[PDB]
Amino acid sequence: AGVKAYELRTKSKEQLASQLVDLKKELAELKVQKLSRPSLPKIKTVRKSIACVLTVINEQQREAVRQLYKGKKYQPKDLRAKKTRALRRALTKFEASQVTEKQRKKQIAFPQRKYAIKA
Amino acid sequence: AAQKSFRIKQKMAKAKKQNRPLPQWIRLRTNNTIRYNAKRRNWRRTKMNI
Amino acid sequence: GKGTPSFGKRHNKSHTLCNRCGRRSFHVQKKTCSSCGYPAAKTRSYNWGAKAKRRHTTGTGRMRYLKHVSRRFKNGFQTGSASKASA
Amino acid sequence: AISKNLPILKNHFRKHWQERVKVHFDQAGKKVSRRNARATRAAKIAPRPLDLLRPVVRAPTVKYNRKVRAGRGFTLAEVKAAGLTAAYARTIGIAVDHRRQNRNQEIFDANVQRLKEYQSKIIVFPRNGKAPEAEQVLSAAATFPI
Amino acid sequence: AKQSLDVSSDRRKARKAYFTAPSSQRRVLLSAPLSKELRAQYGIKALPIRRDDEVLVVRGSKKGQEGKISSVYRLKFAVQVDKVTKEKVNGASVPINLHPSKLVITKLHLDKDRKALIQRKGGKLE
RNA sequence: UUGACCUCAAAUCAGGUAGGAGUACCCGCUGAACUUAAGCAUAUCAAUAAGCGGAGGAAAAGAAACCAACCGGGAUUGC
RNA sequence: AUAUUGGCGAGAGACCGAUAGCGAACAAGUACAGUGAUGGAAAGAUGAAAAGAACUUUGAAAAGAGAGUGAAAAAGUACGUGAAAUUGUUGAAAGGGAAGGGCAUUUGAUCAGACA
RNA sequence: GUCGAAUUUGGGUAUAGGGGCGAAAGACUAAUCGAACCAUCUAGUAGCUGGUUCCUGCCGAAGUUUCCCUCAGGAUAGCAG
RNA sequence: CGUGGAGGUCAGUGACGAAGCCUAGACCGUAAGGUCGGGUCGAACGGCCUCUAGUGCAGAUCUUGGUGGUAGUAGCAAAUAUUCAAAUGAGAACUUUGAAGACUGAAGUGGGGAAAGGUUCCACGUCAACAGCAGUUGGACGUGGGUUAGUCGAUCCUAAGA
RNA sequence: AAACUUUCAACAACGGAUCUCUUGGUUCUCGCAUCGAUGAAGAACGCAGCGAAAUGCGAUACGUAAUGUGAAUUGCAGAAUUCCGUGAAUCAUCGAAUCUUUGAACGCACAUUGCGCCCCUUGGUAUUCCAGGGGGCAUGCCUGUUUGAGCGUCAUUU
Ligand SMILES: [Mg+2]
Ligand SMILES: [Mg+2]
Ligand SMILES: [Mg+2]
Ligand SMILES: [Mg+2]
Ligand SMILES: [Mg+2]
Ligand SMILES: [Mg+2]
Ligand SMILES: [Mg+2]
Ligand SMILES: [Mg+2]
Ligand SMILES: [Mg+2]
Ligand SMILES: [Mg+2]
Ligand SMILES: [Mg+2]
Ligand SMILES: [Mg+2]
Ligand SMILES: [Mg+2]
Ligand SMILES: [Mg+2]
Ligand SMILES: [Mg+2]
Ligand SMILES: [Mg+2]
Ligand SMILES: [Mg+2]
Ligand SMILES: [Mg+2]
Ligand SMILES: [Mg+2]
Ligand SMILES: [Mg+2]
Ligand SMILES: [Mg+2]
Ligand SMILES: [Mg+2]
Ligand SMILES: [Mg+2]
Ligand SMILES: [Mg+2]
Ligand SMILES: [Mg+2]
Ligand SMILES: [Mg+2]
Ligand SMILES: [Mg+2]
Ligand SMILES: [Mg+2]
Ligand SMILES: [Mg+2]
Ligand SMILES: [Mg+2]
Ligand SMILES: [Mg+2]
Ligand SMILES: [Mg+2]
Ligand SMILES: [Mg+2]
Ligand SMILES: [Mg+2]
Ligand SMILES: [Mg+2]
Ligand SMILES: [Mg+2]
Ligand SMILES: [Mg+2]
Ligand SMILES: [Mg+2]
Ligand SMILES: [Mg+2]
Ligand SMILES: [Mg+2]
Ligand SMILES: [Mg+2]
Ligand SMILES: [Mg+2]
Ligand SMILES: [Mg+2]
Ligand SMILES: [Mg+2]
Ligand SMILES: [Mg+2]
Ligand SMILES: [Mg+2]
Ligand SMILES: [Mg+2]
Ligand SMILES: [Mg+2]
Ligand SMILES: [Mg+2]
Ligand SMILES: [Mg+2]
Ligand SMILES: [Mg+2]
Ligand SMILES: [Mg+2]
Ligand SMILES: [Mg+2]
Ligand SMILES: [Mg+2]
Ligand SMILES: [Mg+2]
Ligand SMILES: [Mg+2]
Ligand SMILES: [Mg+2]
Ligand SMILES: [Mg+2]
Ligand SMILES: [Mg+2]
Ligand SMILES: [Mg+2]
Ligand SMILES: [Mg+2]
Ligand SMILES: [Mg+2]
Ligand SMILES: [Mg+2]
Ligand SMILES: [Mg+2]
Ligand SMILES: [Mg+2]
Ligand SMILES: [Mg+2]
Ligand SMILES: [Mg+2]
Ligand SMILES: [Mg+2]
Ligand SMILES: [Mg+2]
Ligand SMILES: [Mg+2]
Ligand SMILES: [Mg+2]
Ligand SMILES: [Mg+2]
Ligand SMILES: [Mg+2]
Ligand SMILES: [Mg+2]
Ligand SMILES: [Mg+2]
Ligand SMILES: [Mg+2]
Ligand SMILES: [Mg+2]
Ligand SMILES: [Mg+2]
Ligand SMILES: [Mg+2]
Ligand SMILES: [Mg+2]
Ligand SMILES: [Mg+2]
Ligand SMILES: [Mg+2]
Ligand SMILES: [Mg+2]
Ligand SMILES: [Mg+2]
Ligand SMILES: [Mg+2]
Ligand SMILES: [Mg+2]
Ligand SMILES: [Zn+2]
């Protein structure tokens, strides 16, 4: 069998919490059986289910925080884009495009003119 | 020894675990190449250097 | 007596394990590793040591992070998730 | 290590020269890359012709002065006798050189006439939007030989 | 011949790309041609073999025999037919291993997707 | 008494940045000897190897305190 | 425009072909050595397919002898071909302090060609 | 030989290579000492020693002249193709 | 003359057997070599005109690997020493038990520890290799079991020193 | 005459040449610019129904989520509901996560699974002692905030 992710995302914060204890209780018991039976592949499925639950609990507690920070300076470092340490500190497009006031008047008055040679 | 640091016992434990022979079911796998365990170790033959 | 009978007195380690490289090169009295240079902030290596270099460089490890950086670069450092078409 | 009757060679390989050998195996490679370079640029560059107008100039010293050869830029004087300023002439594909001086009228006129013919033989599209597609001539050097 | 700069005629590279191909890639290499019947039926020459299909060995020493594919053995680059086996000396039967390029598909096994594949290759499907 | 100023402090003060890695190529420092000279010290090897500091996708160089001596040329880089 | 025995991705060669080519075509910077800095190997190939020898017999067993599989066991997980040194058997021959060699012929063995 | 002390000895600790340590032997410094061990410069140089891999055909020497820190080597003429 | 590879060509040879290897069998060349038969073998390969070179071995106290004679030879001789029976087992000089004879002689061949090893401890199974005779035995091999702390150590302190 | 030595052959040994193979190596060329305090490179120890290794991973452990494919995986066992389907898979892709003990490595140490401090919380009759849960405290430097120091020094009180 085994738990499906898209079905977990509809369960409540406290519903998934109790699913997890149910799966743990389940997995705890199976380990007792494993040392009698000379195989127990059903156990792989329940420990994958636990993993699949914890992801979902985490996914939702994260997208909670991610939005109540969404749109403002200073959100936590692990919700910021990873990118690269260098890309991280590269000049933003705004302070790149920045141009001196004197420079701006020159780009305006004498831009590179489109032209061609025939006549 | 006989009074050991936990780091020393920890390594000591991992070497106990590595001390078996080739589990024979691997021998049957498709394209299986490994014949025996060629990293096998013995206490009076080769020393662990901690 | 400088031979076999004096060898019978070697029971004391000069180096134990190194925390940083785990090599059993960590000099006890000197408290520094003859291999990786720990505690020194930098890592022991030399350009006369080419084999020694090749033994420890990046890629001899798991590259737990640096592994994926080039694929993440291939995709322009996508921030997001993939949506759908069908199937 | 000296024998027979032979020129005295001076072959400097006493350093570690094998370290610094450069075999151009990439001749064919880099020629293609240079052809592609120019192609990619001619496209980015709109009808503009890949190169700038260059002045006539008399080549220096005693050995080369008999020949005239293309210079760098047009000397603020020559630009001014052709009735346009420096700033604008640069946007038009004319190269301007603040460092070159005119001590010689015959060359001075040649460059003003060169500027005249160039101005006549080009079209400068409006700032607006329209871009009335004109089919780039790639050279200037070929259109305006020296 | 190859005209593209991204094709490789290199023999050493091909043989690596074959044996090291992942399960997904072996699916398409393990294609089998449709029978002359099924071809003009479906307007399609060949298809990647799938499991519960129906097949006729048109090459080799099992030539002429037919059956249902019991498993696609992708690891082994071999397909197995239920009904084509070796009876052993101790009588225990064991599967023979067949190659889909030496089979022919006599009956498909159709899916929403298995149909769409035929449609994506531009052919009718009865 | 109160309020500035200069300079100097302290905070688990608000936000940031530096380290290490790699180092083929690049910018610097430091710096040999074997070798060659049929010996050998100046010389050579070599402004090389090893050692140290620092960058990038290129680095550095670059709009002349330049070259010239011509009817002069005209940032730098490279062939 | 220039550099690039690093890195990511590609296309190649009058290159090497398992003592070659990188040390590493393999659980190779491994096994192993060394207090340590460091040093550092050997090792690819049954067959299209394990069809990897059921069963009988001798044996304590390993195995042998049958049988069986296979296109072939003159392919049996000692596994393609399987040279040489060197070894067993069988057959032939010689041998009074070496053996081997040159010219020549007897004897034995073996063999080509050519008659018509 | 000596055996109650300039005694024996464990552990911890200090001293590192033209450096240490030496009741002094050039001793000892990990089987290494009239300068340890490791890698690199390094395929160091070698007028010296050893080796240098198929056949046949034709021709066929020199150990002498002169100069050289030259005398186990070169240059030069001679002989040879 | 002979090798690896390259351009050309003989629409060359080949699973009805390429290459390789073997052969006091045959033939050509003064020779380097070439050719054929038979055997073995199993997937490729050659002639000619040209190109090319990491291109030919008996030596180098040559490199790596393999193998001889020596030779069933030197040897398996220190630490006083063994013996009878039974059990087991295919098999007993060597295991187990019983008996005898001895030894170490508490400055121990006894009972525990520090350093060092790291599972050698213990049980059951068990002999291909290993224990320079043997092996049913083992510190071997296979499979398992076992190390319990408020008071014992660490941990705290300071020593030379770092 | 044997045996023994030697030579040739056949068959059988030993040994691994040779021939034929090649998911490897070497060299050239073309394209590209991306490690790390948002914890890199490296290390240790772990993780599978049955694994010593290699490869992969991190107590969510040969993997979790997502996306594409569209029925496998396979050495054995296995589940069986996964087969006209939000669905097989040791698949591909990868944009979301987890990520032990460490490491520039950052509370202090470290031949120690050694030893502190603060905050929230839970249990033990507890602001103070013990225990469980979670979150924290390195260094240099910059900008700024706040509390300050100095007869360095200006003013202002009455
Ligand atoms: Mg020992
Ligand atoms: Mg070891
Ligand atoms: Mg070691
Ligand atoms: Mg010490
Ligand atoms: Mg120190
Ligand atoms: Mg540190
Ligand atoms: Mg030169
Ligand atoms: Mg180059
Ligand atoms: Mg141009
Ligand atoms: Mg417009
Ligand atoms: Mg298709
Ligand atoms: Mg702060
Ligand atoms: Mg740095
Ligand atoms: Mg040199
Ligand atoms: Mg000299
Ligand atoms: Mg000399
Ligand atoms: Mg000298
Ligand atoms: Mg110099
Ligand atoms: Mg100099
Ligand atoms: Mg250097
Ligand atoms: Mg440096
Ligand atoms: Mg960068
Ligand atoms: Mg560039
Ligand atoms: Mg200026
Ligand atoms: Mg210039
Ligand atoms: Mg390259
Ligand atoms: Mg090799
Ligand atoms: Mg060769
Ligand atoms: Mg090698
Ligand atoms: Mg083979
Ligand atoms: Mg073989
Ligand atoms: Mg038999
Ligand atoms: Mg038989
Ligand atoms: Mg055969
Ligand atoms: Mg065979
Ligand atoms: Mg067998
Ligand atoms: Mg064989
Ligand atoms: Mg004879
Ligand atoms: Mg006849
Ligand atoms: Mg005849
Ligand atoms: Mg010295
Ligand atoms: Mg010195
Ligand atoms: Mg000194
Ligand atoms: Mg020694
Ligand atoms: Mg010594
Ligand atoms: Mg040499
Ligand atoms: Mg030498
Ligand atoms: Mg001499
Ligand atoms: Mg003559
Ligand atoms: Mg003189
Ligand atoms: Mg001599
Ligand atoms: Mg020839
Ligand atoms: Mg041949
Ligand atoms: Mg012979
Ligand atoms: Mg004949
Ligand atoms: Mg043949
Ligand atoms: Mg074959
Ligand atoms: Mg030729
Ligand atoms: Mg050679
Ligand atoms: Mg030889
Ligand atoms: Mg010889
Ligand atoms: Mg010779
Ligand atoms: Mg030899
Ligand atoms: Mg004997
Ligand atoms: Mg004897
Ligand atoms: Mg003796
Ligand atoms: Mg005795
Ligand atoms: Mg006895
Ligand atoms: Mg007594
Ligand atoms: Mg006594
Ligand atoms: Mg035995
Ligand atoms: Mg033993
Ligand atoms: Mg024995
Ligand atoms: Mg025995
Ligand atoms: Mg055991
Ligand atoms: Mg106590
Ligand atoms: Mg404590
Ligand atoms: Mg093959
Ligand atoms: Mg290649
Ligand atoms: Mg696995
Ligand atoms: Mg879907
Ligand atoms: Mg996957
Ligand atoms: Mg610290
Ligand atoms: Mg801790
Ligand atoms: Mg905590
Ligand atoms: Mg401040
Ligand atoms: Zn270390």
Side-chain angles (χ1 to χ4, degrees):
Chain A
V3 151
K4 287 186 182 180
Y6 59 60
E7 282 173 345
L8 291 187
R9 289 171 235 262
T10 83
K11 286 200 173 184
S12 141
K13 301 181 168 187
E14 67 102 45
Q15 280 189 299
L16 300 160
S18 193
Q19 251 263 237
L20 188 282
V21 213
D22 282 329
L23 277 161
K24 281 178 163 172
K25 235 208 202 69
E26 242 248 45
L27 181 272
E29 268 150 50
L30 257 66
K31 298 195 276 209
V32 189
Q33 307 180 0
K34 183 196 191 285
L35 49 69
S36 294
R37 235 146 285 147
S39 161
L40 213 19
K42 239 112 178 190
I43 206 179
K44 166 183 170 230
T45 81
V46 31
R47 78 206 340 173
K48 255 61 192 328
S49 279
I50 304 182
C52 191
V53 170
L54 287 155
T55 312
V56 177
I57 308 182
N58 209 325
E59 263 204 89
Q60 290 181 338
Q61 268 152 32
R62 288 190 65 92
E63 88 193 336
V65 187
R66 187 139 26 186
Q67 285 190 324
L68 56 99
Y69 278 93
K70 220 289 153 48
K72 65 205 305 165
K73 266 161 82 167
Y74 316 133
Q75 58 156 343
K77 261 161 184 170
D78 52 309
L79 291 164
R80 286 131 104 122
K82 172 55 111 87
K83 230 144 136 51
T84 243
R85 183 204 221 246
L87 294 166
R88 219 98 56 59
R89 45 218 79 188
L91 283 185
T92 89
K93 208 183 262 201
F94 167 78
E95 6 123 302
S97 56
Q98 233 17 69
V99 76
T100 247
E101 233 268 277
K102 164 188 193 164
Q103 248 304 295
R104 153 177 186 79
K105 305 182 184 184
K106 211 110 53 64
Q107 295 172 344
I108 295 175
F110 304 110
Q112 171 65 59
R113 300 301 311 264
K114 207 156 323 207
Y115 72 98
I117 305 185
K118 181 101 289 312
Chain B
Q3 214 94 109
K4 342 144 152 43
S5 57
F6 173 74
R7 178 192 318 275
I8 283 306
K9 182 166 166 181
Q10 206 183 0
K11 307 189 84 65
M12 238 191 291
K14 178 171 179 177
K16 176 178 213 275
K17 319 224 259 186
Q18 279 156 331
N19 213 345
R20 50 120 88 244
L22 200 273
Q24 293 313 311
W25 60 258
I26 257 132
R27 286 249 244 159
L28 274 17
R29 293 166 323 142
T30 299
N31 313 312
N32 163 71
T33 178
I34 314 186
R35 293 153 54 90
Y36 65 102
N37 183 349
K39 291 158 121 150
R40 193 72 176 284
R41 177 189 73 80
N42 174 275
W43 72 268
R44 209 152 40 154
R45 277 157 30 192
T46 286
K47 256 53 179 61
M48 303 200 304
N49 300 327
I50 283 204
Chain C
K2 56 171 149 187
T4 64
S6 82
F7 298 147
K9 318 211 202 89
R10 322 183 302 134
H11 44 68
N12 286 295
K13 306 198 196 119
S14 296
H15 320 76
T16 45
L17 311 174
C18 185
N19 279 6
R20 202 209 261 147
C21 63
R23 235 218 151 262
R24 224 275 231 108
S25 306
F26 183 73
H27 193 288
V28 172
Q29 325 212 29
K30 217 184 307 193
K31 294 287 215 290
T32 157
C33 180
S34 78
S35 200
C36 78
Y38 169 84
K42 316 206 180 203
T43 285
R44 234 212 51 161
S45 68
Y46 293 94
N47 308 282
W48 51 257
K51 281 214 202 191
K53 260 185 195 152
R54 113 214 310 199
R55 288 190 193 101
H56 298 97
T57 21
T58 115
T60 90
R62 298 167 48 161
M63 285 193 296
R64 318 208 289 313
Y65 173 62
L66 223 214
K67 253 181 190 274
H68 316 285
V69 183
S70 65
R71 138 159 74 76
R72 285 202 310 137
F73 157 82
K74 207 244 308 174
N75 307 332
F77 297 89
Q78 284 170 328
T79 76
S81 27
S83 287
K84 244 148 171 195
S86 278
Chain D
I2 285 175
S3 77
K4 318 182 183 77
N5 172 32
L6 294 169
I8 292 164
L9 322 167
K10 336 174 47 179
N11 291 343
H12 305 44
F13 307 97
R14 275 164 262 250
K15 311 183 198 180
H16 299 331
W17 61 275
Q18 286 165 111
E19 242 147 23
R20 291 179 294 279
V21 192
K22 179 146 86 198
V23 278
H24 309 251
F25 279 146
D26 47 300
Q27 218 191 348
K30 302 223 289 179
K31 184 188 192 181
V32 169
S33 313
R34 263 174 285 113
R35 301 195 84 236
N36 298 349
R38 303 194 277 273
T40 325
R41 178 157 126 109
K44 182 200 175 58
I45 292 304
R48 297 200 288 117
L50 266 205
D51 84 309
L52 303 206
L53 220 225
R54 257 53 216 233
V56 228
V57 115
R58 215 124 250 268
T61 80
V62 187
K63 190 189 186 197
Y64 288 116
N65 54 6
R66 351 114 46 173
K67 306 297 253 266
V68 75
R69 140 282 260 210
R72 182 193 179 78
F74 260 101
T75 83
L76 325 173
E78 289 162 4
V79 135
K80 196 223 201 176
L84 55 186
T85 45
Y88 176 75
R90 320 197 88 97
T91 60
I92 286 319
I94 308 180
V96 190
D97 181 12
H98 59 275
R99 322 186 198 99
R100 191 175 111 246
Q101 296 317 108
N102 292 93
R103 292 135 285 216
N104 171 12
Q105 189 80 48
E106 328 290 67
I107 285 275
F108 176 80
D109 305 315
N111 291 303
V112 190
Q113 234 262 97
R114 248 180 93 86
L115 282 183
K116 240 73 152 275
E117 305 197 346
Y118 177 75
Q119 287 208 244
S120 96
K121 298 252 292 102
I122 71 155
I123 86 224
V124 178
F125 298 131
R127 282 243 221 166
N128 283 320
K130 24 219 63 271
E133 191 84 301
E135 85 120 68
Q136 66 189 342
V137 157
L138 278 176
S139 175
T143 1
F144 304 85
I146 299 205
Chain E
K2 134 194 160 318
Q3 233 77 8
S4 153
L5 284 168
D6 315 271
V7 202
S8 173
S9 300
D10 182 285
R11 169 187 177 94
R12 188 240 260 235
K13 281 180 170 145
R15 286 177 48 78
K16 219 241 186 96
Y18 177 75
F19 296 102
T20 63
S23 181
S24 66
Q25 267 164 70
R26 286 160 184 238
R27 173 187 164 277
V28 184
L29 305 156
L30 287 169
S31 285
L34 300 187
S35 83
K36 39 272 122 168
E37 171 165 321
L38 281 195
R39 191 200 315 192
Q41 223 245 66
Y42 289 101
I44 262 194
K45 199 196 234 79
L47 278 168
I49 241 274
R50 107 137 244 179
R51 189 205 300 112
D52 281 292
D53 279 280
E54 224 138 74
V55 114
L56 196 235
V57 187
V58 82
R59 269 301 132 80
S61 276
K62 302 316 183 186
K63 174 111 170 288
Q65 318 201 4
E66 33 194 62
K68 223 176 190 64
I69 272 89
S70 51
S71 66
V72 174
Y73 217 124
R74 282 173 170 174
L75 217 229
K76 294 221 202 94
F77 280 106
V79 86
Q80 285 179 345
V81 157
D82 178 46
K83 269 178 189 191
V84 178
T85 66
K86 265 200 184 81
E87 277 54 82
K88 211 202 277 211
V89 294
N90 58 40
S93 209
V94 131
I96 241 110
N97 280 359
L98 296 162
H99 199 265
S101 67
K102 311 292 161 254
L103 300 179
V104 119
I105 294 189
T106 69
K107 278 296 179 301
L108 280 191
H109 170 297
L110 290 95
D111 271 350
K112 281 237 219 303
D113 321 351
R114 241 281 178 98
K115 283 177 193 193
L117 184 52
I118 308 176
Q119 295 190 106
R120 238 186 296 121
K121 312 175 75 185
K124 28 231 244 67
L125 129 67
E126 91 132 339

